[PDB]
Amino acid sequence: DLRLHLLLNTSVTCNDGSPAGYYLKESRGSRRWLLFLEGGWYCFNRENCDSRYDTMRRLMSSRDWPRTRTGTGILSSQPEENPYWWNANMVFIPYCSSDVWSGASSKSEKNEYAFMGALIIQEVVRELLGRGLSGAKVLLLAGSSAGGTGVLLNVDRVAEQLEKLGYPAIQVRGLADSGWFLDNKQYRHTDCVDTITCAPTEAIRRGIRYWNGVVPERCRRQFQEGEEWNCFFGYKVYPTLRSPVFVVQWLFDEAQLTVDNVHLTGPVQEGLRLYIQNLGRELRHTLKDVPASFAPACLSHEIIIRSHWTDVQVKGTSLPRALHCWDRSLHPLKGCPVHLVDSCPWPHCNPSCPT
């Protein structure tokens, strides 16, 4: 179990002004630290944030959080469940800012909600340095879904923060799971006039304004004002980064298909067959020059904190093994690969896909 700590700096808050926080399980014999970012979509105006507050309030507030949480998958402390980092110090950071971890705005007489995701990460790092993180050799910033995108947006800022604080020896790295999206054409079109129909590019453009969103400096300097939404898309922001980042991405991610207005129920036809095959090929193409990556040909969503994350394989190598091979490479290795991308072109052409 991981134990809840609410942030001592009460100005760093969830959407509704309640304190943000983190769940921690220490491993005093270890100098490895894993900080995991939860996911769960986002909201981008008053009306759709109000809806989220009625029926998704744990993603908006800490007032009902439980005192503990069980570590699962890569957050498990049992070697049978977590062959990769079972002995590390474990941290789970709840997603309560609805801003893809990019916001830097407080609640005020001008703002009904606070959007502080980027500041929550920095405050968690600061308060952990007093609880053992000061002695770390590696800090791995991981996350799933919106948390995976959050890794891409924040990993270099964590690195810069520790450097300026006097800790140049801590190696910051990132692990982005199911957060690598494409700004592609939808299979069927919908005009952005309310939430249902509003494509990611437009929703994120409005979000950055609503959230006072922050993106990495180098990417911001390339795309410039009004175009920072580009930095929320992995294939555009990744080349600007400097911290080592391992990318885990299903070729046919269910959230990607949702934003593309694809609904698979049933006998496809030719038009949709070609659309799905082209999506797989495009994703594959964006990963061609990503040296640490794991991309199976499955229709699924998230993986690294699922209890059965050990079961999927690409070219005979599991995800925990590929992550271990990555660790070795950061000290090619014979029989210990780090770049693993399926080539077959249809969902579940890989027999190890989740059922």
Ligand X SMILES: OCc1cn(-c2ccc(Cl)cc2)nn1
CB 325 within 8 A of CB 336: yes
Does 41 bind ligand X (CB under 6 A)? Our answer is yes
Contact of residue 115 among ligand NAG, ligand X, none (CB under 5-8 Å per partner type): none
Would residue 98 show up in a list of annotated catalytic residues for this protein?
no
Residue 119 touches ligand NAG, criterion: CB under 6 A: yes
How far is Cα 179 from Cα 246, in angstroms, rounded to an integer?
A: 12
Q: Token match 């694809």: residue?
A: 262
For every residue of 79-110, DSSP letters joined together read: TTT-TTTTTSEEEEE---SSSTT---B--BTT
CB-nearer residue toward ligand X: 162 or 204: 204
Closest CA to 142 of 321, 323, 14: 323
HSE-up of residue 297 (Cα within 13 Å, Cβ side): 20
Residue 145 known to be catalytic: yes
The minimum distance between CB 12 and ligand NAG, in angstroms, equals 5
Segment 147-206, which members bind ligand X (CB under 6 A)? 149, 181, 200, 204
User: Considering beta carbons, is residue 211 or 294 the nearer one to ligand NAG?
Assistant: 211
Toward ligand NAG, which CB reaches closer, 130 or 266? 130
Residue 176 DSSP label: E
Rounded Cα–Cα distance for residues 331 and 8 (Å)? 36
Q: Which is nearer to ligand X, 74 or 162 (CB)?
A: 74
Q: Looking only at residues 122 through 141 of this chain, which bind ligand X when binding is defined by CB under 6 A?
A: none
* DSSP helix/strand/coil, 117: helix
232 binds ligand X (CB under 6 A): yes
12 binds, among ligand NAG, ligand X, none (CB under 5 to 8 A by kind): ligand NAG
* Residues of this chain that bind ligand NAG (CB under 6 A): 9, 11-12, 119, 123
- Catalytic residue positions, numbered: 145, 253, 301
